[PDB]
Structures are given as C-alpha cells and as structure tokens.
C-alpha cells in the first residue's frame, strides 16, 4: 500500500528514494532483488558517476550468487557507496554492508550484524563459494583469512560497535 | 479498495502523508519498517522542524524491524508525536513510548502492553530482550528492575496506567 | 469491479460516497478497516469540522480493540455523526451504531441489531468486556447491570426494540 | 475481462450512466453495498427518473438482501426490476419489490421463492417471517399462501410468477 | 494407544464389562450408533442392573443425541448419568435424562443448556423438542427453560442441580 | 474404537448385533453401505428363511441407486423385516424405513422423518429415478401417486406421528411392550 | 496480456472488436459471461437499433440459466445478429449459435457442433429446463420436438455441414465472399 | 513402533499399567482425559489402598479435560504419587500439585509452569478462578499469591516449585 | 515394514532388541519418543538393576525438555548405560551420548557429533534451559563452563576422535 509524494511531478515514495540516490536492500536477497538493485546502481552511475550512492540494508541474507551479483556491481560502479545498516544485516547482507566505500559504512545503534552463514549443488562447489565469501570479507575488514573463518563459524550476531571494531563498518550513528 | 480525495487528487493514504502523518498499522515486519522509515526520512526532508505524527495501532512484530523504526525515530530531528489507537503491544508500544517527550498520546479506550508475547540462539534472543529493557527504561524513566518485572506480566494496561508508568504523556477524548 | 461516475471529474463510486461525506463500515471489522474508517473520519473533519458525517454500518462485528479505535475516533472528532444501520449491526457494529450523536442514530426497517458478543489472558477479556458494558451503558443511557444482562442473551433486536433499548433514535422507511 | 466504450466508460459504468444496476450472482454484503451505493447515487442524480435493477441471482445472505430491499423502499424513484436467467430466494424478493406495474422478466427465466436450506433458531424463524411478510406485501397474497408456496422446493415460470404477484410484465 | 488389562481386555472393553458407557466429546451419528449398541447390549445382559453413562461432551448433532436420549427412555435399566469435565448442549440433555436421583456431577464440571442443512421451521421444531425434553426432566416450566437456554453461559454443578438438571454433586464416595 | 463383549466367546459390539439379526443402516448410504447391508440381509436369510430381521435406520439419505439395491434385497429375501427409525430417516433412509414388513415399521418418539429428496446423469434419467421412488413410496404408504408427488415437493420433516398417519411407519414406541 | 491497437485513438484489441459490433462468447458460460455479453448486446443496440451484431462463438457450454439469459437478450434486441461458430459450439454454445437471425448463422469449416447436453435442483426442475431447450432448438432448426429430443440423446458432435442440414446454422464459409 | 515385553506378553505401555503407572503425556484433551480417567477408575478397582503413579510430561491442554482428571483424582481413594519429567505446564502442573501430599515429585531437570497460555469472557474468568482455587488449595498459598504468580510468563525450577507448594520432593535417583 | 524373528516365542525385531537390553534413540526426540525411551529404561531396571543397558543413538536432536526427560531417567536408573553413536548425534543426541556411564561411551568410526544447538517461550526461559545444557555437558565432559559454551557456539560437527578427546565419548570402535 505504497504512498505517493509530490515534488511539480508525483512519484511513489520508493521512486522518490531512488531520486535522492537511495537504493534499498530490504530483505531476503534473490535474483530479482539483485536485478532491481543492480539496475538501480547502474542507473545512478549513469546520472553522475562521482556523486555518492547510499544503499540501505535490512536483510537476513539470501542466495549467495545473487548477493555477489550486487557486490560485484558495487565494486564496478565509479561512485562512492555509503552503506547503512538498520534492523539487521546477516549473511550476505553484512557482506554488502562491509563492502561500502571505506569510511562510509554505517549502522544505527540497535542494528544486529551477522557474518556467520545460516545453513542444490556439489560439495566442492559450496566450499568454492564459501572461500569467495572468506576472501571478500578479508578484503574489506582487513582481517586475516583464519580470523575471518573462525569468526564465520560462531553462530552469532554482533552489535554495531563490535562490527565496527572488526572491520565491517566505520561509524555507528545516533544523529545527523 | 482505497478512496480518492480532492487542485490535484491523492488516495486517502497519500493524503495522510501530506498531513505529515505516518501510520504504523498491524504487525511490524521489515517491509512495513521500510515503508515507515522512508516516510519518516521523506517527512524530515520536507521540514526538519515541523512535527511528525505516528498513528500506532499494532500488536508488535519482528523485533529488528521495530528497532529499525525506533532507531530511525531517534535519528531524525523532528518532534515526533506518537498516537495509540486501539492498542500498541510489544514492539508497537516501544515505538509509542519513543515519541518525543510530552508528545506521546493515547485515545481513551486503547490497551497498551510491554510484555513481549511468546531463527536464532538463546544468547541472541536474550541480547535482544536486553536491548528492549534499555530502550524502555530510557524512555519511561523507570529502572531496569522495574522494566523487567513489568515486562514479565502477560497483561495490558489502560492508557492511564500507561501514562503513569511512563509510556504516555497525554490521554484525551477530543482536541 | 467498482463503477465510475462523473469543470468535470470522474470518481469510482466509493470515493463519490466519501465526497457526500459518507463513510461505510461494511462487513467484519479489523485493524485495516479501522485504519480506513479513521482515515476517512479525520479527513472529513478536516474539510469541515461542523458539517455532519454519515456513517453506514452493515456489519457482523469484528476485532474489539480495532472496533474501539473507530469508536474513539468518532468521539474525538468535532463533527456531528449520523449513523445508519442497514442489513445488520452485531457486536462492534452495534456499538459504532449506538455511538453516533444523540438523536442522529438510524436504522432502516428490516435491520437486525445485536449487542451480544460472539490470544489474551482471561483478565484482559473481562477488562475488555467491561469497556463494552461502559460504552453501551453511556450511549443507550441504560444501567450497567441491565447492559450485562442483555448482552448474555444470544438474540437479535428489531430496529424498534433497539430504538426502545437505547441503541438508536429513529427507524425510517422513506426520507423525511 | 471488461471492454471500454465511447468520453470513455467501461461497459458496467456505461450501464450505470443508463440508470441500470445489475444484481448478478450471489448476494453478500459487498454486493449489497455496491448496489446500495448505485441506488443512492442514482436518486441523487434525479429522484423522479426510474432506476433499473437487472436481477440474475440465486440469492445470498438474507440480511444483505434485506439491506437492498430497504434501500429500494427508501428511495423515491420508480424502480423497474428485470429478471434474466433466474431470480431465486433473495433475488426473487427484490424482483418482487420493484414498484408495481414495473416488474418484468424475460420469457425463459426461472423464479423461486423457496428459501434453499451461524445464528440461533428463534433468530432464524424471525428472519423467515420478515420475508414471509415482505412477500405477502408485494404479491398481495396472504401469509398462509406465502408460506405454503415457500415450502415447495420449485421454480415458477414467468407466467406462474406473474399470476402469483411476483411480477407484472412478461415479454 | 489403548492399554490392555487382565481379569484380557482393552480398558474401554473393560469399562463396558463394568456396565459403564462413555459419552466422550462431540455427538454424531457414529457416536450415537456406538452408544446405543452398548445400551441395548447392557439391557440384554440384565434389565434391572443400572447402567452408568459417563458424559464429557460439548454437544453434537441434535438428531443423534436424540437417538441416544430415546434409547435411554426405551431401556428398563436405571441409568446413572455422571458429568465429568463438561456437559454442553446435547451432552447436558442426556445428563438430565438420567434416572431421577442418580444424576451426578463431579465438583468442577461445567453444564450448559444454551445451544450454539435444514429449514427454519425445522430448526424451530427440533428446538421445541429440546424445550419439552428439558422441561420434562428438570420439572421446570416451558417458559423457564427457554429464558435459560437463551443465556449463553455455563452453570456450576450446584446451579445445575437447583435447576433440575442433576441431583447430586460428589467430591468422593 | 469398537468395544469387545463376551458371550464362551468374544465379539465386537457390532458383530454381536448381527448375532441378534440386527442390521444397521447408519449414515449416508453409498454403494459400500449397500454392499455391507446386502451382505447381511443375504446372510441372515441363510441362517433362517423365516426368522425376522431388524434394520435400525438412522440416515439422512444417500445414492439413489445404492438405496434401491438395498430396497430390492429387502424385497427379495423371505424374512419379515422390522424397521426402526432412530434419530432420523430422510430421503432413501425413509424409503428403507417405509419398506419394512407391513405393520413392522417403527419409530422412536423423537425421530424426524423426511421423504423429500434434497437437491452424473441426463435429465430423463433423474426423472426416471424420481418416478421409481414415487412408485415405491406409493406402494408401501398406500398413498396415491398424486399425494406422494406433492408431499415430496415439500422440503420438510414429519414427526413419527405424522409419518405413521402418512403411511411411512406403523407404530411409534416409547418403551418395550 | 491484451495488446493495444491505434485508430486518433488507442484501444485494447478486445475493446476495438466491440467497436466493430463484434461480441465474443468464448468458453464456459456462467452468470458473468452472460452479464458481460448482455451488457454489450444492450449497448450495441443503443448505438444502432438496426445495425447487425456479430457473435463469435467458441464455447463448450455452460450454466443453462446463464445461457438462456443470453438467448433471451438476443431475442429482445431489435438487431439482426450474425452468429459465427469457431473451434466449437457445444450444449448452450450451439443454442446461441442456432439462435442467430435466420440465414445469418455461420460456421467456419473445421468447427465441431454439439447439441447433446453433457451430464443444485430438483428432478422436475431439470426436466423443466431440458424441455425449454427442446423448444428453443425445435424453433430455430425447424425440427420437430421428437427429432430434437433424440438427436440430443446422441452423445456426439456434428460437422458444420451436418449442423447446416440439421438446422443449427445456414452457411459453412471458408473465405470471405 | 511400540515394543512387547514378556513376563506372558504385554506391550510396554500395558506393562506400566500393571505397575499402577498412569502416564499423562503431552497435551491434555478430552480423549487423553478419557484414557487417564479410565485407568484411575480401573486401578482403584484393583485396590483403593495401593498407590497410583501419575507420570506427567505435559505442556497443558483443555481446562475442562484437565479438571475432569483432577476431579477423578480427588474421587478415588488411592494415594496418588505424581512425578514430573521434562515439564508440567498450565493444566499439567495443576495435576502435579494435586497428588497426595508428601508424594509429589520432580526429576532434577523438569520445568514447571502455572502460567496459563469458543466461550464468553465470563466463563473463562469463571474457569480461571477455578484454577486459582485448586492451586491455592494444593500449594497452601493464598489466592493473592496464586493469582499474581500465574501472571508471570515463566517456568520454575523443581526446587522453586517445591518451595511454592507445587511438589514435595526432587530426586536425582531412588 | 518390521520383520519378525523367532527365539520358541516370536517377536518383531525391535521387541527383540529390547530383550537384549538394547534401547534405540533413533531420530528427532519429542515427548512420545522420550516416553517410549523412558518406559524402556525403567522396564530394564525392573528386570535387573545391575545388568547394563545399551542405548543406541542416531539422532539429529529434538525438543529440549523431552531430551532432559530421557537424560534424567538415565541419571536415575541403577544400571550402567553403554551409549553408542552411529550416523550422528547432534544437539540433545550427543547430550544423551555424553551422558552414558563413564568408560562406556562409544562411537563407530564415521559418526558425526554436534554439541552446538541448531536454532514458543519467553527469552529468559530459553537462556535458563540453555544453562542446563551447559552444566550437563560440563558435568560429563569434565570441561569448564566457558570452554563448553565457546564450543557450543561453533556451528560444527566433530569426528568420533575429536569428541572422545573433548569428553563426549570414551572409545571409538571399528570391531568387537
Ligand atoms: N548486470 C550487470 C552489470 C553490472 C555491472 C556492470 C555491467 C557492465 N555493463 C556493460 C554494458 C553497459 C553498462 C555496464 C552500463 O552501465 N551502461 C550505462 C547505463 C546502464 C544502465 C542504465 Cl539504466 C543507464 C546507463 C550501459 N549502457 C548501455 C550498455 N551499458 C553489467
Ligand atoms: N534505512 C535507513 C536510515 C534511517 C535513518 C537514517 C539513515 C541515514 N541516512 C543517510 C543517507 C540519507 C539520509 C539518512 C536521508 O535522510 N536523506 C534525505 C532524504 C531521504 C528520503 C527522501 Cl524521500 C528524501 C530525502 C538522504 N538523502 C541522500 C542521502 N540521505 C538511514
Ligand atoms: N489514528 C488516529 C487518531 C484518531 C483520532 C485522533 C487522532 C489525533 N490526531 C492528532 C494529530 C492530528 C490529527 C488527529 C488530525 O486530525 N489532523 C488533521 C488532519 C488529519 C488527517 C487528514 Cl487526512 C486531514 C487533517 C492532524 N494533522 C496533523 C496532525 N494531526 C489520531
Ligand atoms: N446504507 C444505507 C442507506 C440506505 C438508504 C438510506 C440511507 C440514509 N441516507 C442518509 C444520509 C444520506 C443519504 C441516505 C443519501 O442518499 N445521500 C445522497 C447521496 C448518496 C449517495 C451518493 Cl453517491 C450521492 C448522494 C446523502 N448525501 C449525504 C448523506 N446522505 C442509508
Ligand atoms: N437403533 C435402535 C433402537 C434403539 C432403542 C430401541 C430399539 C428397539 N429394538 C427392537 C429390536 C431389538 C431390540 C430393541 C433389542 O434390544 N434387542 C435385544 C438386544 C439388542 C442388542 C444386543 Cl447387542 C443384544 C440384545 C433385540 N434383539 C433382536 C431385536 N432386538 C432400537
Ligand atoms: N447383490 C445382491 C443380491 C441381493 C439379493 C438377492 C441376490 C440373489 N442371489 C442369487 C444367488 C444366491 C443368493 C441370492 C443367496 O442368497 N445365496 C444364499 C447365501 C448368500 C449369502 C450368504 Cl453370506 C449366505 C447364503 C446364494 N448362495 C449361493 C448363490 N446364492 C443378490
Ligand atoms: N439483463 C437484462 C436485459 C436483457 C435484455 C433486455 C432488458 C430490458 N431492458 C429494459 C430497460 C432498458 C433496456 C432494456 C435498455 O436496453 N436500455 C437501453 C440501453 C441499455 C444499456 C446500455 Cl449500455 C445502453 C442503452 C435502457 N436504458 C434505460 C432502461 N433500459 C434487460
Ligand atoms: N468419568 C468419570 C468418573 C470419575 C470418577 C467417578 C465416577 C463415578 N463412577 C460411578 C459408577 C462407577 C464408578 C465411579 C466406578 O469407579 N466403578 C468401579 C470401576 C470402574 C472402572 C473399572 Cl475399569 C473398574 C471398576 C463402577 N463400577 C460400576 C459403577 N461404577 C465417574
Ligand atoms: N517418567 C518417569 C520417571 C523416570 C524415572 C523415575 C521415575 C520414578 N518412578 C516412581 C514410581 C515407580 C518407578 C520410578 C519405577 O521405576 N517402578 C518400577 C518399574 C517401572 C516400570 C516398569 Cl515397566 C516396571 C517396574 C515403579 N513401579 C510402580 C511405581 N514405580 C519416573
């Protein structure tokens, strides 16, 4: 039941959010989510490839290759990407969260962050995908492999404060 | 089916938004939180001084979805008037009591519940309950001790007991 | 499929009903119906807080706390509210019907009215059931004990007994 | 789904511009509120010009049908009821409540006043007397003649239903 | 599921050997058919020895409960009805149809005579059957029975006993 | 579950009923209700060509062809059959009720009896079947076709006492003679 | 999804059909098929009391009362109506086919036409309805009752050419005249 | 599914009945209650002095189904030993507390709840009062203590429950 | 489709297993499983309370209070209890496995053992139950609390060899 706003043109509030260069990553990440997000990120680059992009994550995770789709598009565009976590970023959600422009990775105070991966393909393939997750997290947290994979074994959430200290985000904000 | 009102014409819900009114109706999940946060943010983009009104008629919902609203309420600058209609239970009463002080209201016949009624580990659930304990104590001026024994009783309060406990400031019959 | 009716503007018939300052409470009552009726009632009060609103009730009841949100918004707003019972008004429907302005509570001749009531602790259900007694007591101008007695009988009233009981003021057949 | 005719309407809206109100299929609360809407809307447009209720229905919720009956009886306009296909149970009630000399059916229609088979038992009998009464009113038959007929699980043809008092014209 | 006792029966076959007939939960044609069979068997074994009918039911199909009620009237034995838990709607009409003086409840039972695809005249007709049955066994007047069944509520064993539904309320022998 | 009773010998209560030459017609009658009922009419006749059988009927009706199968077995076998109506006998239930041995058809007092037929084949075939019911009911009630055809058009129930006056049964009994 | 076509003005293809005074009876006919078809017979008549309307029929039948509603609208309105059978017209479909203006009822070559009625109400009421279909078919085919009643008892389809010789239609066309 | 033991050959549940052991397992409905009440009537016909053993591992159930069991336990003359295993919650703990005084037992790890989780609001409140009074009776607590307790959405330990009046002993072994 | 064996009496093979004093704990543990197991363990004690009892665990876990029911009955009976793990013992399964008589806790070579708890009650209650699990495991593994709870956080299985070394079992056997 999505509301309309005027600005004189008239958009629904989500079209409006994308006009402010805000892309939502809200919920379980599947291919068509990934498709929406990728579409938006590439449209904002076309508008201005130096102007920043804010991406808002409230995601329990999802389909791993769909998330890497987003992640890869993040790495590709020319824009700074402020990532913001509200509610939670678990599994691929905090992967996207940890993959913002350094210095521009934010959570609100009561957010919950998980890098552990909640548990139809071959066994070695899953391990392959799981190393990919291990290196991406190592890249952006500036942590070691063995630290990352020990960490990813703890079935557990962090506070915005621990996640900052671990390298997943940069600033925990209450106010602007 | 949602009616149109009327010089251009919005559906009634779009028109509630022009009043700076954000409805939080029913159970709270992430996509409701997405809708509420967007409006809060947009309403602050419109003026960051002009108040915002949050009509809460909710039984609770996903804790982190509700926290994403609570946090966003705290983030924005505007005075936030919160309104309880029918009932605000579990996460929905956290929100109701998070409105800016002296600006939390109930219509007379509502019911208010801070009891949390009832896939993660038991150490994580408990971490989340602790976060609720602290929010509630922060906004009702009550001690954690008072907050926990109270949240332990499976009961509703009238808007008056609510106002006395520190969830509400006003109860009113009319403007 | 809702019909359209017709400077010159074009309305679906239900908006048109709201232009006439009519709000409908058709069928069972839940939070989303209540959101809709409160939205319409607060809007009508904003277009004129002295002009009457007409509220049409054909309803078998509903969620109590959702029904009370409607009742309280009736009592809040500034406008005279003339209620009309068509078809039936049982439980919360009859309470909305009985909570129009004194002397502007109507039924058409064949309506059936019920004040008998068809997960929460047992003490909260009695708390709530007592709020119902207090509201019916108020507007029907009947004693508490008489309300509690009446609400124990699993029966409907004629629009003429409910006139007689306190629930409505006039039974109309044709327009005055 | 639904075509568009030429200013442009959809056909069911174009019909309403013609002062025509369909009653089509089973009657429930939302049929009734849609029908009562149109009836009021039409009388607001003119209280002298007749309205046309096209009924093809096997009935429905008694209270929902009673709601439409009363709205008919409230509004001032002459009302021409039209039976098409069938008007059975509640449907036949409204058909019979068109204003006199204006109740029609088409030749091959079927008309039933037998009421085919959660509230208390006394409250069910109360509702049935209401229809007994409503029917006796508009057919000018007696209550003993209404209840007897209402017990025979059967249709009448338009001519049977004309002699009974349900309608006036068959074409 | 059902345990086996020696004396070799299932426990419910052994209740029947004790002349105990359970009427558990909702009445329908199947339940009624069962019950009636045991009632005729028991009489066939002896038309003088009582039969203990154990009732704990929210009611059921009217026609089916009436088949039971009729069977009860037919057979010669004194029938001791026992309410455990609850007897509502039809369940409490059988309770009332025990032999006078041997209608019992346990302390915490609940008793209800209020009643929760056929025609209106027929639903009223069956309701008058219930009216007259209840009036006969409570010795209460018709008009007292109908007021009663309209109040949607339960009676405690002692209000059920002051009304003529049962006779005795036992905490223990 | 079906209790077991002792006799020296163990029977489940329903088996021990058949021992009494009692046959139960309980519930909707389909082809396998009919099959099981016919199985025991034929059986009970082979235990005695002349000892009376008892049908306990509590039924709201059923498949017409499955009902007529039972009616026809009932007509075939040589046994006097006493019918008993308990709870109800509507539609084909009441036809099995009416078809007991003249003067052996009974109701308990509180039973409800209906002969109206409540609402894949062609149209001529349903009127074929309706007519067959007319003639069966006409036969045993001793009523005229005309009277059967309109009584059945009244969607209503008869008391055991009106059913006795119409012809469906012969005695309404409260206690054992 | 329904394409849009341009005319200056945009119509979805089905709307633009109605513009040609074409009305489609496609599929099972229930009360709301009938309602929408009647809506456009009445509409097209009000655009012209005498210009011919075209019913395209491809239907396997439907609710008899809903069919007879359409038949009756078709009889009411003053317009000459050309019927066209495409794919099939079985049961009430073929009755709407037969009821076009004499000599305006058509089939394309490969259509299949059935008048047999493939297999809640009482029995007298279904024979009531069957008889009404007998008289409608009798009327427009110009066949006797006796002939209609047995043709309809044959569970079978007719070619457009046999249907033309029976009376259901008048012309079987391959290309436009 | 259910095994046979030899002694003569019972299924293992039939053999527990021969020990005078009545099992109240899982949610209590009128059917559980039928089975339980049957067993208690029978076991008393065997002897009205020999103790009955009610093993309870139950989350709760229908209240009238529960009170039928309770009333049957009051009716019979036998000393009843109640034992709690896994848990006894809502109606279950009510049965646990209702065994013969000095004979109510829990295993060291059981959890006990007296908090309760179509009829009118005056019936529920009538039923709840009835739970209030059974409980008050059997824990020697007051009504006020009992009512406030049942309002806390919480389980107790077996020692807690022992201190409160719900049970007498807590045994790791015999 | 359970087979019968003769021994001359004739039992199904599972009745036969219980005659050899073998009780299976096979699969998800719910109240009626727990009831079966408890029944069997108490019947074997009645036969001989010094003769050992072998309990065979292939369980992914289950309802925690139902498992403690079994555990408590284990602690209660007088008999030695050899526990044997085949396939897997995860969550409450390895709790029962770790709760055998010391010296009599066995796995086959390819078994998989989990003490981590795969993830409708109050929050503090779940923590209470979870401390119970923490102490029981500490009791029988002779490990510390902090070691146990760190361990229970690793979403992960052990080999019969690691589980022995950790204190969950005593012997890993290939042959008799
Ligand atoms: N899925 C995926 C994926 C993710 C990251 C990078 C790429 C590579 N593509 C190659 C083609 C390509 C790219 C980048 C591109 O961004 N623009 C500019 C553009 C795109 C969208 C919008 Cl709305 C407006 C302007 C473009 N314009 C035409 C061809 N083209 C693909
Ligand atoms: N989920 C979440 C969450 C909740 C609270 C606070 C934040 C932090 N963000 C930072 C980025 C950011 C924020 C707040 C922001 O309010 N506007 C202004 C704005 C927003 C919507 C509309 Cl329609 C119009 C204007 C904005 N415009 C560009 C960058 N930007 C995120
Ligand atoms: N749910 C609930 C509920 C039910 C009854 C009473 C209230 C109290 N609120 C206080 C705030 C408040 C109220 C009433 C108010 O009526 N208008 C005027 C207005 C509202 C909507 C529209 Cl479409 C047009 C004009 C308003 N404009 C900004 C703030 N505001 C809430
Ligand atoms: N359900 C019901 C029911 C059935 C029959 C009679 C009534 C009584 N009401 C009184 C209020 C009332 C009525 C009739 C009324 O016809 N119009 C005129 C009107 C209505 C609809 C439209 Cl689209 C346009 C104009 C009106 N305009 C302001 C308030 N109002 C209610
Ligand atoms: N349904 C019904 C219904 C309900 C109440 C009363 C009756 C009347 N019937 C008549 C036939 C009849 C009756 C009573 C009868 O009790 N016994 C004795 C008997 C019955 C069952 C068993 Cl297991 C053992 C012995 C009997 N033996 C042969 C025929 N017969 C029928
Ligand atoms: N369906 C059907 C239906 C219904 C009624 C009548 C019939 C006709 N059949 C003819 C053959 C036939 C009949 C009757 C027959 O009764 N017995 C004797 C018998 C039958 C069953 C049992 Cl258990 C014991 C003894 C018999 N024994 C051998 C051949 N035979 C069929
Ligand atoms: N269902 C049915 C059914 C089927 C066939 C015939 C009839 C009888 N009615 C009588 C009233 C009536 C009729 C025919 C009529 O055709 N027009 C003209 C009209 C209709 C619709 C449209 Cl879109 C445009 C113009 C009309 N305009 C006002 C009253 N009126 C009913
Ligand atoms: N539900 C219920 C309920 C609960 C508690 C008390 C009662 C009252 N009845 C009275 C009749 C009665 C009772 C108790 C009784 O215990 N025995 C002895 C007996 C019972 C079962 C078995 Cl397996 C073996 C022997 C008995 N034998 C004949 C009459 N009779 C009913
Ligand atoms: N659930 C639970 C649970 C778990 C552990 C311990 C207990 C305590 N009970 C007390 C009563 C009790 C116990 C132990 C007992 O083992 N036997 C001996 C016995 C048991 C079963 C069988 Cl098949 C054969 C002999 C006994 N015989 C009669 C009373 N009785 C309960």
């Amino acid at each position: 039941l999505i509301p309309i706003v005027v600005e004189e043109r008239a958009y629904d509030i989500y079209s409006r959010l994308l006009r402010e260069r805000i892309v939502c990553v809200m919920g379980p990440i599947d291919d068509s989510v990934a498709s929406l997000v990728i579409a938006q990120l590439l449209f904002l680059q076309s508008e201005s490839n130096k102007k920043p992009i804010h991406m808002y994550i409230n995601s329990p995770g999802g389909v791993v290759t769909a998330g890497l789709a987003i992640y890869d598009t993040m790495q590709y565009i020319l824009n700074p990407i402020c990532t913001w976590c509200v509610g939670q970023a678990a599994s691929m959600g905090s992967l996207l969260l940890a993959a913002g422009t350094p210095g521009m990775r934010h959570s609100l105070p009561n957010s919950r962050i998980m890098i552990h991966q909640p548990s139809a393909i071959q066994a070695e393939e899953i391990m392959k995908l799981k190393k990919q997750l291990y290196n991406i997290y190592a890249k952006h947290t500036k942590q070691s492999l063995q630290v990352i994979e020990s960490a990813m074994e703890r079935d557990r959430y962090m506070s915005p404060m621990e996640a900052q200290e671990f390298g997943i985000l940069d600033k925990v904000l209450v106010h602007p």
Side-chain angles (χ1 to χ4, degrees), chain A residues 3 9 33 36 63 75 86 100 104 116 130 147 150 168 171:
Chain A
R9 324 177 146 153
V33 160
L36 256 171
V63 191
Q75 294 303 129
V86 292
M104 280 140 97
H116 161 78
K130 174 75 148 280
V147 168
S150 244
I168 283 133
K171 302 129 157 54

Side-chain angles (χ1 to χ4, degrees), chain A residues 112-116 153-159 162:
Chain A
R112 285 329 276 179
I113 289 110
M114 200 175 41
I115 70 164
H116 161 78
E153 222 191 329
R154 287 296 152 151
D155 185 356
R156 156 183 133 74
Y157 291 77
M158 338 174 96
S159 53
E162 311 175 39

Side-chain angles (χ1 to χ4, degrees), chain A residues 40-156:
Chain A
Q40 278 153 120
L41 288 182
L42 289 186
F43 162 80
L44 295 180
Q45 189 188 230
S46 96
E47 297 253 282
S48 171
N49 45 17
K50 298 312 214 191
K51 206 158 162 220
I53 307 188
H54 321 254
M55 157 190 308
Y56 288 173
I57 297 136
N58 199 4
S59 174
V63 191
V64 158
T65 65
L68 307 167
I70 296 161
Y71 168 79
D72 262 2
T73 297
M74 298 211 258
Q75 294 303 129
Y76 180 92
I77 48 181
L78 271 145
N79 319 75
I81 311 193
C82 301
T83 55
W84 294 80
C85 174
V86 292
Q88 85 184 303
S91 320
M92 314 278 321
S94 61
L95 186 127
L96 308 186
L97 168 71
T101 280
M104 280 140 97
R105 290 168 332 162
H106 314 273
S107 176
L108 285 206
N110 297 269
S111 292
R112 285 329 276 179
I113 289 110
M114 200 175 41
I115 70 164
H116 161 78
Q117 281 286 310
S119 24
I121 64 179
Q122 224 49 41
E124 296 75 4
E125 167 57 11
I126 326 178
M127 255 328 276
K128 268 163 137 222
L129 270 179
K130 174 75 148 280
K131 310 246 199 231
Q132 301 220 301
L133 300 192
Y134 285 148
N135 297 333
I136 282 168
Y137 275 120
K139 202 208 154 35
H140 300 260
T141 59
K142 301 196 99 297
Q143 302 273 356
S144 93
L145 280 158
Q146 55 264 47
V147 168
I148 282 305
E149 326 175 9
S150 244
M152 314 248 282
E153 222 191 329
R154 287 296 152 151
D155 185 356
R156 156 183 133 74

